[PDB]
Coordinates of C-alpha atoms (C1' of nucleotides) in Angstrom, one line a residue:
Chain A
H23 CA -7.3 12.4 46.3
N24 CA -5.2 10.3 49.0
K25 CA -4.0 11.5 52.3
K26 CA -0.2 11.7 53.1
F27 CA 1.4 13.6 50.4
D28 CA 4.9 12.2 49.8
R29 CA 7.0 13.3 46.9
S30 CA 9.6 10.5 47.0
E31 CA 7.0 8.0 45.7
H32 CA 6.4 9.9 42.4
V33 CA 10.0 10.2 41.6
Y34 CA 11.4 7.6 39.0
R35 CA 14.9 6.5 39.0
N36 CA 16.1 3.7 37.0
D37 CA 19.8 3.7 35.8
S38 CA 19.5 0.9 33.5
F39 CA 19.3 3.0 30.2
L40 CA 22.4 5.5 30.4
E41 CA 24.3 2.6 29.0
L42 CA 21.9 1.8 26.3
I43 CA 22.2 5.6 25.2
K44 CA 25.8 5.7 25.1
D45 CA 25.7 2.7 22.9
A46 CA 23.4 4.3 20.6
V47 CA 25.7 7.5 20.1
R48 CA 28.9 5.5 19.8
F49 CA 27.2 3.6 17.0
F50 CA 25.8 6.8 15.6
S51 CA 29.2 8.2 15.3
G52 CA 30.5 5.5 13.0
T53 CA 27.6 5.3 10.5
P54 CA 28.6 6.5 6.9
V55 CA 28.4 10.0 6.1
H56 CA 26.2 11.0 3.0
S57 CA 25.4 14.2 1.1
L58 CA 22.1 16.2 1.5
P59 CA 19.7 14.2 1.2
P60 CA 20.9 10.7 0.5
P61 CA 21.4 9.2 -2.7
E62 CA 18.4 6.8 -2.3
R63 CA 15.2 6.7 -0.4
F64 CA 14.5 4.4 2.5
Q65 CA 12.0 3.2 5.3
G66 CA 12.5 4.0 8.8
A67 CA 12.2 6.5 11.6
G68 CA 15.2 7.5 13.6
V69 CA 17.8 10.3 13.9
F70 CA 20.0 12.4 11.8
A71 CA 22.7 14.9 12.0
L72 CA 23.5 17.9 9.4
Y73 CA 27.2 18.9 8.7
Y74 CA 28.3 22.0 7.1
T75 CA 31.8 22.3 5.1
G76 CA 31.0 25.6 3.3
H77 CA 32.1 29.3 3.7
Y78 CA 29.0 31.4 4.2
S79 CA 31.0 34.1 6.6
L80 CA 29.0 33.4 9.8
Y81 CA 29.7 29.6 9.4
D82 CA 33.2 29.6 8.1
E83 CA 34.6 27.9 11.0
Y84 CA 32.9 24.5 10.1
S85 CA 34.7 24.4 7.2
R86 CA 37.8 24.3 9.5
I87 CA 36.3 22.1 12.1
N88 CA 35.1 19.6 9.9
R89 CA 37.9 19.9 7.2
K90 CA 39.2 16.6 8.2
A91 CA 36.4 14.4 9.5
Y92 CA 32.7 15.5 9.9
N93 CA 33.1 16.6 13.5
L94 CA 30.8 18.9 14.6
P95 CA 27.1 18.9 13.5
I96 CA 25.1 22.0 12.8
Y97 CA 21.7 20.5 13.5
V98 CA 20.4 17.1 15.0
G99 CA 16.8 16.2 14.3
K100 CA 14.5 13.1 14.7
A101 CA 11.7 11.5 12.6
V102 CA 9.4 9.9 14.9
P103 CA 6.6 7.2 13.9
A104 CA 3.6 8.6 12.8
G105 CA 1.3 8.5 16.2
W106 CA 2.9 10.6 18.5
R107 CA 0.1 13.1 19.5
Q108 CA -2.7 11.1 18.8
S109 CA -1.7 7.5 18.3
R110 CA -4.4 6.8 15.6
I111 CA -2.9 3.7 14.0
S112 CA -6.2 2.2 15.0
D113 CA -7.6 0.3 11.9
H114 CA -4.9 1.7 9.2
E115 CA -1.6 -0.1 10.4
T116 CA 1.0 0.2 7.7
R117 CA 2.8 0.3 4.9
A118 CA 6.1 0.6 6.7
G119 CA 6.5 4.2 7.0
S120 CA 9.6 6.3 5.8
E121 CA 9.3 9.3 7.9
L122 CA 13.3 9.9 8.6
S123 CA 14.2 10.0 4.8
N124 CA 11.2 12.1 4.4
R125 CA 12.4 14.8 7.0
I126 CA 16.0 14.7 5.7
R127 CA 14.7 15.7 2.3
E128 CA 12.4 18.1 3.7
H129 CA 15.2 19.8 5.6
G130 CA 17.3 19.6 2.0
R131 CA 14.5 21.4 0.2
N132 CA 14.4 24.3 2.8
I133 CA 18.1 24.8 2.5
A134 CA 18.0 24.9 -1.2
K135 CA 15.5 27.7 -0.9
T136 CA 18.0 29.7 0.9
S137 CA 19.8 32.5 -0.7
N138 CA 23.2 32.2 1.1
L139 CA 23.4 28.3 1.6
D140 CA 24.6 25.7 -0.9
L141 CA 23.0 22.2 -0.5
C142 CA 26.1 21.0 -1.9
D143 CA 27.9 21.9 1.4
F144 CA 25.9 19.8 3.6
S145 CA 26.2 16.4 4.4
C146 CA 24.4 14.1 6.9
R147 CA 24.6 10.8 9.1
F148 CA 21.2 9.3 10.2
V149 CA 20.4 6.1 12.2
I150 CA 17.3 4.2 11.8
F151 CA 15.8 2.6 14.8
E152 CA 13.9 -0.4 14.0
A153 CA 10.6 -2.0 15.5
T154 CA 10.7 -1.4 19.2
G155 CA 13.9 0.5 19.0
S156 CA 11.6 3.5 18.1
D157 CA 11.3 4.1 21.5
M158 CA 14.7 5.4 21.8
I159 CA 14.5 8.0 19.0
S160 CA 13.8 11.1 21.3
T161 CA 16.4 10.0 24.1
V162 CA 19.3 9.6 21.8
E163 CA 18.3 12.8 20.0
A164 CA 18.4 14.6 23.3
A165 CA 21.8 13.0 24.0
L166 CA 23.3 14.0 20.8
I167 CA 22.2 17.5 21.4
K168 CA 23.6 17.6 24.8
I169 CA 27.1 16.3 23.4
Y170 CA 27.2 18.7 20.5
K171 CA 24.9 21.6 21.1
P172 CA 24.5 22.2 17.6
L173 CA 23.9 25.9 16.6
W174 CA 20.5 25.4 14.8
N175 CA 19.5 23.5 18.1
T176 CA 21.0 25.6 20.8
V177 CA 21.4 29.4 19.3
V178 CA 19.2 29.7 16.3
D179 CA 15.4 28.5 16.2
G180 CA 13.3 27.8 13.6
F181 CA 14.8 25.6 11.3
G182 CA 12.6 22.5 12.0
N183 CA 9.1 24.7 11.3
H184 CA 6.5 24.0 9.2
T185 CA 4.3 27.1 7.5
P186 CA 2.2 28.6 10.2
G187 CA -0.4 28.7 7.4
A188 CA -3.2 31.1 7.2
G189 CA -4.7 31.8 10.4
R190 CA -1.2 32.6 11.6
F191 CA 0.3 35.0 8.8
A192 CA 0.5 37.6 11.9
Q193 CA 3.1 35.8 13.6
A194 CA 7.0 36.3 13.2
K195 CA 9.5 34.5 11.0
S196 CA 12.2 32.6 13.0
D197 CA 15.4 33.8 13.7
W198 CA 16.5 30.9 11.1
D199 CA 14.5 32.6 8.5
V200 CA 15.8 36.2 9.1
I201 CA 19.5 35.2 8.6
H202 CA 18.6 32.7 5.9
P203 CA 15.7 34.2 3.8
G204 CA 13.7 32.8 2.2
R205 CA 11.0 30.1 2.4
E206 CA 7.9 31.5 0.9
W207 CA 6.0 31.2 4.0
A208 CA 8.5 33.0 6.0
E209 CA 8.1 36.1 3.6
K210 CA 4.2 36.3 4.2
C211 CA 4.6 36.6 8.3
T212 CA 3.9 40.3 9.2
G213 CA 5.0 39.7 12.6
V214 CA 7.8 41.6 14.0
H215 CA 11.2 39.2 13.8
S216 CA 14.5 39.7 15.7
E217 CA 17.0 42.0 14.3
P218 CA 19.8 40.5 12.3
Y219 CA 22.5 41.9 14.7
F220 CA 21.3 40.1 17.7
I221 CA 21.2 36.7 15.9
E222 CA 24.6 37.1 14.4
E223 CA 26.0 38.4 18.0
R224 CA 24.6 35.1 19.3
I225 CA 26.2 33.3 16.5
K226 CA 29.7 34.6 17.3
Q227 CA 29.0 34.0 21.0
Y228 CA 28.8 30.3 20.0
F229 CA 32.0 30.3 18.2
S230 CA 34.1 31.7 20.9
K231 CA 34.2 28.6 23.5
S232 CA 37.4 26.5 23.1
Chain B
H23 CA 29.7 10.0 0.4
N24 CA 32.3 7.9 -1.3
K25 CA 30.7 4.7 -0.2
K26 CA 28.0 2.5 -1.7
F27 CA 24.4 3.0 0.1
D28 CA 23.6 0.7 2.5
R29 CA 20.5 1.0 4.2
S30 CA 21.4 -1.9 6.6
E31 CA 24.6 0.2 8.0
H32 CA 22.4 2.7 9.6
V33 CA 20.3 0.3 11.4
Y34 CA 20.1 0.1 15.2
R35 CA 19.0 -3.1 16.5
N36 CA 17.5 -3.0 20.1
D37 CA 14.8 -4.6 22.5
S38 CA 15.5 -3.7 25.9
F39 CA 14.9 0.0 25.9
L40 CA 11.4 -0.8 25.3
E41 CA 11.5 -2.8 28.8
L42 CA 12.6 0.6 30.6
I43 CA 9.1 2.2 29.3
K44 CA 7.3 -0.7 30.5
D45 CA 9.2 0.0 33.8
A46 CA 8.0 3.4 33.6
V47 CA 4.8 2.9 32.4
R48 CA 4.0 0.6 35.0
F49 CA 5.7 2.3 37.9
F50 CA 3.4 5.5 36.8
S51 CA 0.4 3.1 37.2
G52 CA 1.2 2.6 40.9
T53 CA 1.6 6.2 42.0
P54 CA -0.6 7.9 44.6
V55 CA -3.5 9.5 43.1
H56 CA -4.1 13.1 44.2
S57 CA -7.1 15.6 43.4
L58 CA -6.4 18.5 40.9
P59 CA -4.1 20.0 41.8
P60 CA -2.3 18.1 44.3
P61 CA -2.5 19.2 47.9
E62 CA 1.1 20.7 48.1
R63 CA 3.5 22.2 45.6
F64 CA 6.8 20.2 44.9
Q65 CA 10.0 20.5 42.4
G66 CA 10.5 18.3 39.5
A67 CA 10.1 17.9 35.8
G68 CA 8.2 15.0 34.5
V69 CA 4.8 13.5 33.2
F70 CA 1.2 13.6 34.6
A71 CA -2.3 12.3 33.8
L72 CA -5.7 13.5 34.5
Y73 CA -8.6 11.8 35.6
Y74 CA -12.6 12.3 35.5
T75 CA -15.3 10.8 37.8
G76 CA -18.1 13.5 37.5
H77 CA -21.5 13.5 35.8
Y78 CA -21.3 15.9 33.0
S79 CA -23.7 14.2 30.4
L80 CA -21.1 13.5 27.4
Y81 CA -18.4 12.0 29.8
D82 CA -20.6 10.3 32.4
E83 CA -19.2 6.9 31.3
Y84 CA -16.1 7.8 33.2
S85 CA -17.9 7.7 36.5
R86 CA -18.5 4.2 35.6
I87 CA -15.0 3.3 34.3
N88 CA -13.3 5.1 37.0
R89 CA -15.8 4.1 39.8
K90 CA -13.8 1.4 41.3
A91 CA -10.1 2.7 40.8
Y92 CA -8.3 5.8 38.6
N93 CA -7.9 3.6 35.6
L94 CA -8.4 5.5 32.3
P95 CA -7.2 9.0 32.0
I96 CA -8.9 11.8 29.8
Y97 CA -5.7 13.5 29.3
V98 CA -2.0 13.1 29.4
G99 CA 0.7 15.5 29.4
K100 CA 4.5 16.5 30.2
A101 CA 6.4 19.3 31.6
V102 CA 10.1 19.4 30.9
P103 CA 12.6 21.3 32.8
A104 CA 13.5 25.1 32.1
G105 CA 15.9 25.6 29.4
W106 CA 15.2 22.1 27.6
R107 CA 14.7 23.7 24.2
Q108 CA 18.3 25.1 24.1
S109 CA 19.9 22.6 26.1
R110 CA 21.1 24.9 28.8
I111 CA 19.7 23.0 32.1
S112 CA 19.8 24.4 35.7
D113 CA 23.2 25.2 34.8
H114 CA 23.9 28.2 36.5
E115 CA 21.5 28.0 38.6
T116 CA 18.3 25.9 39.1
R117 CA 17.1 22.2 38.4
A118 CA 15.0 23.0 41.9
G119 CA 12.4 24.3 39.4
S120 CA 9.0 23.1 40.0
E121 CA 7.5 23.0 36.3
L122 CA 5.7 19.7 36.7
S123 CA 3.5 21.2 39.5
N124 CA 2.9 24.4 38.0
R125 CA 1.6 22.8 34.6
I126 CA -0.7 20.5 36.4
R127 CA -2.1 23.7 38.2
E128 CA -2.3 26.0 35.1
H129 CA -4.4 22.7 33.9
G130 CA -6.6 22.8 37.0
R131 CA -7.1 26.4 36.4
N132 CA -8.3 26.3 33.0
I133 CA -10.7 23.4 34.1
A134 CA -12.1 25.8 36.9
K135 CA -12.8 28.4 33.9
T136 CA -15.4 26.1 32.0
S137 CA -19.1 26.6 32.6
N138 CA -19.6 23.1 32.4
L139 CA -16.7 21.0 34.3
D140 CA -16.5 20.7 38.0
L141 CA -12.7 20.6 39.3
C142 CA -13.4 18.5 42.1
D143 CA -14.6 15.8 39.6
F144 CA -10.9 15.5 38.2
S145 CA -8.0 13.7 39.9
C146 CA -4.2 13.3 38.8
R147 CA -1.1 11.2 39.0
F148 CA 2.1 12.4 38.1
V149 CA 5.8 11.1 38.0
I150 CA 9.0 13.1 38.3
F151 CA 12.0 12.2 36.4
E152 CA 15.1 13.5 38.0
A153 CA 18.1 14.9 36.4
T154 CA 19.3 12.7 33.4
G155 CA 16.2 10.9 33.3
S156 CA 14.3 13.9 31.8
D157 CA 15.8 13.1 28.4
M158 CA 12.8 10.4 28.8
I159 CA 9.9 12.6 29.6
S160 CA 8.8 13.1 26.0
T161 CA 8.7 9.1 25.5
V162 CA 7.0 8.3 28.4
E163 CA 4.3 10.4 27.7
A164 CA 3.9 9.0 24.3
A165 CA 3.7 5.6 25.5
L166 CA 1.0 6.7 28.0
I167 CA -0.9 8.0 25.1
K168 CA -0.3 5.0 23.1
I169 CA -1.6 2.8 25.8
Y170 CA -4.7 4.8 27.1
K171 CA -5.4 6.7 24.3
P172 CA -7.2 9.5 26.4
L173 CA -10.2 11.2 24.9
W174 CA -8.5 14.7 24.9
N175 CA -5.2 13.6 23.5
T176 CA -6.8 11.4 20.7
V177 CA -10.4 12.9 20.2
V178 CA -11.2 16.3 21.8
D179 CA -8.4 18.3 21.1
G180 CA -7.2 21.8 22.5
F181 CA -6.9 21.7 26.2
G182 CA -3.2 21.4 25.6
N183 CA -3.2 24.9 24.0
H184 CA -1.8 27.7 25.8
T185 CA -3.0 31.1 24.3
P186 CA -2.1 31.5 20.7
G187 CA -1.7 35.0 20.9
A188 CA -1.9 37.8 18.3
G189 CA -0.1 36.8 15.3
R190 CA -2.4 33.7 15.5
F191 CA -6.1 35.0 16.1
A192 CA -7.2 33.8 12.8
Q193 CA -7.1 30.2 13.7
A194 CA -10.2 27.8 14.5
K195 CA -11.4 27.4 17.9
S196 CA -10.3 24.1 19.1
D197 CA -12.6 21.0 19.6
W198 CA -12.4 21.4 23.5
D199 CA -13.1 24.9 23.8
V200 CA -16.3 24.6 21.5
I201 CA -17.5 22.1 24.1
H202 CA -16.1 23.6 27.1
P203 CA -16.3 27.5 26.9
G204 CA -14.8 29.8 28.4
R205 CA -11.3 30.1 28.0
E206 CA -11.3 34.0 27.1
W207 CA -8.8 33.7 24.4
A208 CA -10.6 30.9 22.5
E209 CA -13.4 33.6 21.7
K210 CA -10.8 35.7 19.9
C211 CA -10.1 33.0 17.4
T212 CA -11.9 33.3 14.0
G213 CA -11.2 30.4 12.0
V214 CA -14.2 28.1 10.9
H215 CA -14.0 25.4 13.5
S216 CA -15.9 21.9 13.8
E217 CA -19.4 21.5 14.9
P218 CA -20.4 20.5 18.3
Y219 CA -22.7 17.7 16.9
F220 CA -19.9 16.1 15.2
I221 CA -17.7 16.4 18.3
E222 CA -20.3 15.0 20.6
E223 CA -20.6 12.2 17.6
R224 CA -17.1 11.5 18.2
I225 CA -17.1 11.3 21.9
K226 CA -20.2 8.9 21.7
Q227 CA -18.0 6.8 19.1
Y228 CA -15.0 6.7 21.8
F229 CA -17.2 4.8 24.2
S230 CA -18.6 2.4 21.6
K231 CA -15.6 0.0 21.1
Chain C
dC1 C1' -9.7 7.5 -7.8
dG2 C1' -6.5 4.7 -4.4
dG3 C1' -1.6 5.2 -2.1
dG4 C1' 1.9 8.2 -1.4
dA5 C1' 4.1 12.7 -0.6
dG6 C1' 4.1 17.0 0.3
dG7 C1' 1.1 21.2 1.4
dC8 C1' -1.1 23.9 5.0
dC9 C1' -3.6 23.7 9.0
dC10 C1' -3.4 23.9 14.5
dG11 C1' -1.8 21.2 19.1
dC12 C1' 1.4 20.9 22.7
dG13 C1' 3.8 23.5 25.7
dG14 C1' 8.7 26.4 26.3
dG15 C1' 10.4 30.7 27.3
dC16 C1' 10.8 35.1 28.3
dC17 C1' 8.6 39.2 29.9
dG18 C1' 6.0 41.8 33.1
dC19 C1' 3.4 42.5 37.4
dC20 C1' 3.6 41.4 42.1
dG21 C1' 4.5 40.5 46.6
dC22 C1' 8.6 39.9 49.4
Chain D
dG1 C1' 14.7 44.0 42.4
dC2 C1' 13.5 39.1 43.1
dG3 C1' 11.6 35.4 41.7
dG4 C1' 7.2 33.3 41.3
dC5 C1' 3.0 33.4 38.6
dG6 C1' 0.7 34.6 34.8
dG7 C1' 0.0 35.5 29.9
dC8 C1' 1.4 36.0 25.6
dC9 C1' 4.7 35.2 22.2
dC10 C1' 6.5 31.4 19.3
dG11 C1' 9.1 26.6 18.6
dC12 C1' 8.6 22.4 16.6
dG13 C1' 6.4 19.3 14.3
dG14 C1' 2.0 16.0 13.7
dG15 C1' -1.7 14.7 11.0
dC16 C1' -5.1 15.8 7.5
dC17 C1' -5.9 17.3 2.8
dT18 C1' -4.8 17.4 -1.7
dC19 C1' -3.1 16.6 -6.1
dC20 C1' -1.0 13.4 -8.9
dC21 C1' 0.0 9.1 -11.1
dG22 C1' -1.4 4.4 -11.0

DNA sequence: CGGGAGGCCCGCGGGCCGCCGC
DNA sequence: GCGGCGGCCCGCGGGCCTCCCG
């Protein structure tokens, strides 16, 4: 403890970065668009976007919005370097990892298990933030989400989830699993999930705004 | 697609964003130290670190590391503003929330619950990131953890847990709990958990190079 | 039988609900 | 009945574990 509490001295303002962020976003937007997952595997961590062009009833708008360019993301994720929680890269260095390609791939697999979504109707964009750049990954991801408010980011939860595992079978599958059954593990959960009607209604709210 | 695939076309080269973290990390280091919890409540979202100065056997070494200054944190966390998960911020009708303060206190309180740690032996530092700097919170925390590798984040897991609740009761009591009862809810967990000897043996290792 | 990738655990803490004191 | 405080759900995904191919 120290006498004289003064809140002003704990606040961190440094505007320098906003322009760094808008430079990243700017760049992201012009990166080539590939199918899901990309035709080759690659090393790197970074950020990515998923785009829909199919006609599943609830999402048909995207085939309209995205008809002429990949304009609106359904989802935007990030693959951060290994070591975010414990930072234990302490005596086993690398092996330049490839965690971005891996998530993107994982997400492709999950879609491919759904009954009502066709992986052929998704594409992506992704950026690799190198060496020291890796520090941006999160911040850019937030900006992208602030700009597009992608549906699986701002209305429908659970796309990005891993299995809860035994020990957590009792919890509820996510909204994302209720409307898109089924990853196996989603079907082993006994927990009371949302009711399809509420999730569908949230989705319609999302597509009302001009 | 339509293209070739040219990994190179997706690469973002940047070097100065790292300097921003440096600035934030160094600034954090400078901020006034307060006990746990801080003497007053305050509004803001951001990052905080916790400090030990006590003599509970296993952690006694901190009383020698932090003897002269608040050097090495035992745990580093974050608190992000309300509606961050679905990017509906103080829209309508906040940003005047006080989530940083509030989590610092839930932390104090968990500690107060243990039978073998004394709250007075803990101090803290915190940084508030204001609007539009809150995008950064996540990252500063990660750097702070990379730099200080704080025992609880990197070795004695669990302090971070809120109650897992029903639905998750079959998981294993966390390392942290198994050395620091008694959070009510940890007793409800039924998974096969790690052994005190190996947890203590890991703490001994933390202080050995 | 070691390195990599994907499987299967729980960590951190966000969000929302309910109880409480205004 | 509000909003502040706690408590109890789970999102979101990191990391070790495994299984397999050398």
